[PDB]
Write a protein that binds this DNA or RNA. Structure first.
Lengths: 177, 89, 59
RNA sequence: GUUAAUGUAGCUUAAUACAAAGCAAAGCACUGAAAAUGCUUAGAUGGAUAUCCCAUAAACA
């Protein structure tokens, strides 16, 4: 059997929508009492303005969340895949998950693996194979080599359907936000 | 037998009321999701202007539960509050 | 002092705010269950293929 | 299509009678927090009969 591991990376949305003006006037009111009752170079809000086409760059979007999606090549297949790597029984899922972070992306991205339990598994057969879909949280991401020759794409769910058609790959949305 | 440790959330915001409002709001998020909150301690002012930091203790998480919760907190972010997750001493 | 129209205008937005939040909470609760069900469903899938693999994973 | 599921609102075989009920659950107010407490918010027969039924989703296919 061919053992293959994959990682469904999650990128946080940096900035939420602006508050309504009706909230602002209330915010001003509470601020005034707050003082009375008180007891004793920045990055651009959106860094896509210059790029407009850098799907490769980690910062494809800042207002919304993103999920890494990397074109992968197998021995007999070449299809658009979620970050995929070959793993062994000795290595645990987090160890396989950690290897995916540096192997495929070769970057100093900041990720923490809190839960060893995997979120998704889908099998494609023609040779029996299975793909492991892990989940993790990103506080921040430092993606080196933005312009790689590979087709790595950071898209949460909008492009998941476009690039991952079959339910074995289009059902990743089930455990996605 | 291992379970998620108790991780304190230090809500730092220049506005005292906003941190308190968010601290109460996030706690309302916590109890609804069945998150136990043992304490709501308050840090001293960050004398330099000053800022106010309020603790919201969180005990008990799950792998799927943690992933969903943290994004919800980010979306819940009203204005100019810095989230923080740190393992309890 | 706020006028009755101002209170009526504010009364409406609180209803909208409450409606939005309750919808978010219901969606959030379903998200917890859906991911947990998928994660639990994910656990079963590999167990059939090889239980030995999870032995490292569960640690 | 064969087997098989699944078809009152988180839960219930509460109910088809005199009501689509009870329960879980929510917002705001009250300022350690929570709870308590007051005022309030959102809801369902996707559907029949005394098994078909279409929808849905699986092993057969």
């Amino acid at each position: 059997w061919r053992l293959s591991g994959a990682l469904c990376l999650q990128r946080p949305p940096l900035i939420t929508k602006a508050l309504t003006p009706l909230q602002e006037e209330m915010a001003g009111l509470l601020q005034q009492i707050e003082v009375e009752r008180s007891l004793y170079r920045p990055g651009a809000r959106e860094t896509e303005a210059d790029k407009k086409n850098d799907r490769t760059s980690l910062h494809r979007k800042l207002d919304r969340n993103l999920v890494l999606l990397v074109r992968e090549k197998l021995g007999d297949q070449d299809v658009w895949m979620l970050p995929q790597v070959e793993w062994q029984p000795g290595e645990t899922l987090r160890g396989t998950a950690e290897r995916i972070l540096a192997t495929l992306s070769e970057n100093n991205m900041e990720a923490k693996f809190l839960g060893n339990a995997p979120c998704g598994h889908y099998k494609f057969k023609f040779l029996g194979v299975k793909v492991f879909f892990f989940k993790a949280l990103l506080l921040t991401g430092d993606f080196v080599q933005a312009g790689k020759k590979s087709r790595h794409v950071w898209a949460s769910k909008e492009e998941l359907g476009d690039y991952l058609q079959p339910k074995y790959l289009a059902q990743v949305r089930r455990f996605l936000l | 037998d291992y379970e998620y440790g108790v991780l304190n959330i230090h809500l730092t915001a220049y506005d005292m009321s906003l941190a308190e409002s968010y601290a109460q709001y996030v706690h309302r998020l916590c109890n609804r999701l069945s998150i136990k909150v043992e304490e709501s301690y308050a840090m001293p002012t960050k004398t330099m202007l000053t800022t106010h930091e309020r603790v919201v203790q969180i005990s008990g998480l799950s792998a799927t539960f943690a992933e969903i919760f943290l994004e919800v907190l980010q979306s819940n972010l009203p204005e100019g509050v810095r989230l923080s997750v740190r393992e309890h001493t | 002092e706020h006028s009755p129209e101002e209170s009526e205008r504010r009364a409406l937005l609180l209803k909208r705010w409450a409606l939005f939040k309750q919808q978010e909470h219901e969606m959030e609760r379903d998200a917890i269950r859906s991911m947990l069900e998928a994660q639990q469903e994910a656990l079963e899938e590999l167990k059939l293929e090889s239980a030995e693999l999870y032995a490292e994973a569960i640690k």
